[PDB]
Amino acid sequence: SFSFGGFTFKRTSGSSVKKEEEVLTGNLQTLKIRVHEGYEEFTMVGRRATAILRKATRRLIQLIVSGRDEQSIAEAIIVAMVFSQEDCMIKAVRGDLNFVNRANQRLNPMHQLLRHFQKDAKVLFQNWGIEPIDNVMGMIGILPDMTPSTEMSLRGVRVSKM
Ligand SMILES: Cn1c[n+](CC(=O)c2ccc(O)c(C(N)=O)c2)c2nc(N)[nH]c(=O)c21
Ligand SMILES: [Cl-]
């Protein structure tokens, strides 16, 4: 496995290769990130939430998440959205990120982006996108305001009961 944002990721299918790529934020800052290229499925296991994730290169395809309560589930969603490396997440950075503060000098850009959205995920959630759901029994959608919905959800994301 490996650990990212307090979650243990275990690949269950697929594969990927690593390459450095530049990306532009919503404030048109250029970040150099390690992009993982390939379709992969993962289990994400945290202390307070768990998820199954399917992703492709820079794209979240499916995230089904369960957890203790809304705060834990939200945190898993944020980690998954940042781990996806999706453009709408990079573009949700609307101000400059600080890479000079001594406390930030040992964060790689992936970790700078995680810390940014951990502080406040509102813009992330507001710009990710919603879709209609044909709600499956035992699951529910989740809206950008982190409230449940039987009718709509963040794109690709569903909440399961524990
Ligand atoms: C988007 N992303 C980030 N990682 C790798 C990652 O976050 C990490 C974390 C801790 C680690 O110790 C290592 C390591 N030493 O290999 C890697 C990823 N790994 C894969 N396979 N796919 C991804 O999309 C991905
Ligand atoms: Cl990086």
Ligand SMILES: [Cl-]
């Ligand atoms: Cl791909």
Ligand SMILES: [Cl-]
């Ligand atoms: Cl696809």
